[PDB]
């Protein structure tokens, strides 16, 4: 069956782990344990196709930036996550995209831009700003909440559907 290698990237604390765990395990992780690098796999049906999701949950703490080249080489599609209440995290997206672009020697890498924590009211990144950023990369923008499950399946499934367009 078809296997899709997804890699979840973004700054510390934006909710990469919570998003992934909500998707695979269907619960919300409230506590904050910084990730080094974890792998998750789950067989799922997407648009009638039975497939395997191979998801790499990566480190947002910059001390581990050295590991980025390895996973960027392996991954087929990248979920670029920021938090809507964390401007700096949104600004950090460009540094992730650039490295992906270098490593893949491509600017048609399957990606989805994700604005997570859309359940919180402390918004400093407005939807339209993120929409504009994603437009410049030629990718979708999707808002999520790992807490309420809003948009979680759509984000990852859209990433799959982007890999398929390539
Ligand atoms: N309200 C709310 N809190 C969230 C959401 N996603 C994550 N959080 C909270 O934000 C904190 C950090 O989440 P986490 O998933 O660990 O972030 P991370 O990006 O995986 N961190 P790291 O890069 O260090 O591995 C946790 O306390 C988590 O509960 C969300 O959608 N809504
Ligand atoms: Ca919990
Ligand atoms: Ca692109
Ligand atoms: Mg994490
Ligand atoms: Mg503003």
Which sequence spans correspond to the domains of the chain? Answer: 1-166
Q: Strand ranges (DSSP E) for 87-163?
A: 111-116, 141-143
Instruction: Please tell me the number of Cα atoms within 13 Å of 53 on its side-chain side.
Output: 25
Per the CB < 8 A criterion, the answer to whether 13 and 85 are in contact is no
| Resolved by | X-ray
**In testing the pocket of ligand 1, which one of 9, 18, 115 has its CB within 8 Å of the most ligand atoms?**
18
- Cβ of 147 below 6 Å from ligand 1: yes
Q: This structure's resolution (angstroms)?
A: 2.1
Tell me which residues have their CB within 5 A of the ion that is ligand 4: 16-17, 35
- Cβ of 37 below 6 Å from ligand 1: no
- Cβ of 35 below 6 Å from ligand 1: yes
Q: Give CA 122 to chain center in angstroms.
A: 21
Q: Which residue has the tokens 């994603």?
A: 134
Phi, psi (deg, nearest 5) at residue 12: -55, 140
Tell me whether strands 111-116 and 77-83 are parallel, antiparallel or unpaired. parallel
Tokens for 43?
């067989």
Tokens for 54?
């191979």
d(CA 61, CA 130): 22
d(CA 152, CA 158): 10
Four-residue CA torsion sign, 28, 13, 93, 16: negative
CATH level 3 topology of 1-166: Rossmann fold (3.40.50)
Nearest CA to ligand 1 atom 16: 32
């Amino acid at each position: 069956m078809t296997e899709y290698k997804l890699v979840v990237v973004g700054a510390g604390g934006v909710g990469k782990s919570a998003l992934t765990i909500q998707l695979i395990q269907n619960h919300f992780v409230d506590e904050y344990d910084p990730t080094i690098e974890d792998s998750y796999r789950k067989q799922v049906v997407i648009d009638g196709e039975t497939c395997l999701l191979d998801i790499l949950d990566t480190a947002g703490q910059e001390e581990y930036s050295a590991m980025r080249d390895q996973y960027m080489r392996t991954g087929e599609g990248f979920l670029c996550v920021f938090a809507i209440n964390n401007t700096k995290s949104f600004e950090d997206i460009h540094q992730y995209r650039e490295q992906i672009k270098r490593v893949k020697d491509s600017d048609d890498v399957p990606m989805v831009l994700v604005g997570n924590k859309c359940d919180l009211a402390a918004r400093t990144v407005e939807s339209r700003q993120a929409q504009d950023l994603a437009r410049s990369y030629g990718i979708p923008y999707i808002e999520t909440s790992a807490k309420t499950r809003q948009g979680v399946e759509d984000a990852f499934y859209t990433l799959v559907r982007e890999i398929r367009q390539h």
